Design a binder for this molecule. Structure first.
Ligand SMILES: CC(C)(CSc1ccccc1)Nc1ccc(S(=O)(=O)NC(=O)c2ccc(N3CCN(Cc4ccccc4-c4ccccc4)CC3)cc2)cc1[N+](=O)[O-]
Length: 145
């Protein structure tokens, strides 16, 4: 669903903007303004909390011009290996943002667009099914937002 794609572009932009960088922002364009906000906030606390499992994980996969989508999907699978939930859902995004920020550091913003697509796909072929069977996103905001 295009809706999801909007969240990715928005979340990614917010993550990049936090490090000074910039990109095609999405905090107002489409709809689901509440979802975007609730997500951004949820992402912040994500990194903050949790001592281990975060700084090392990001290193597990180093997105590269040669890297394939299959290599990125494997990292995501591990995240949702013991089921799926709003808690882990945020991880998916927080993980993508980190990759984008890294690509920029190595003068590879072009990769950013790629990560965005890779996320949109997995989002509509793994979590999408679950999200629909959990009160959609509206619930994520009602509980966490
Ligand atoms: C109230 C508050 C606002 C507090 S902050 C918060 C805490 C946890 C999750 C979200 C928000 N939100 C809040 C509280 C509790 C909840 S909750 O549904 O009970 N969910 C959790 O507590 C929770 C979910 C997943 C977790 N890991 C992710 C993947 N693994 C490696 C791991 C750990 C960390 C990062 C990446 C990875 C990872 C990387 C690469 C591949 C796979 C996994 C191990 C650890 C740890 C805790 C959700 C939310 N939520 O917003 O969705």
């Amino acid at each position: 669903s295009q809706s999801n794609r909007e969240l990715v572009v928005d979340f990614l932009s917010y993550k990049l903007s936090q490090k000074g960088y910039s990109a095609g922002g999405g905090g107002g364009g489409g709809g689901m303004a509440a979802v975007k906000q609730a997500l951004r906030e949820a992402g912040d606390e994500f990194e903050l909390r949790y001592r281990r499992a975060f700084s090392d994980l990001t290193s597990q996969l180093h997105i590269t011009p040669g890297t394939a989508y299959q290599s990125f999907e494997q990292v995501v699978n591990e995240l949702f290996r013991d089921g799926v939930n709003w808690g882990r859902i945020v991880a998916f995004f927080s993980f993508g943002g980190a990759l984008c920020v890294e690509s920029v550091d190595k003068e590879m913003q072009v990769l950013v667009s790629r990560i965005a697509a890779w996320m949109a796909t997995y989002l509509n072929d793994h979590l999408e099914p679950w999200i629909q069977e959990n009160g959609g996103w509206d619930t994520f905001v009602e509980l966490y937002g």
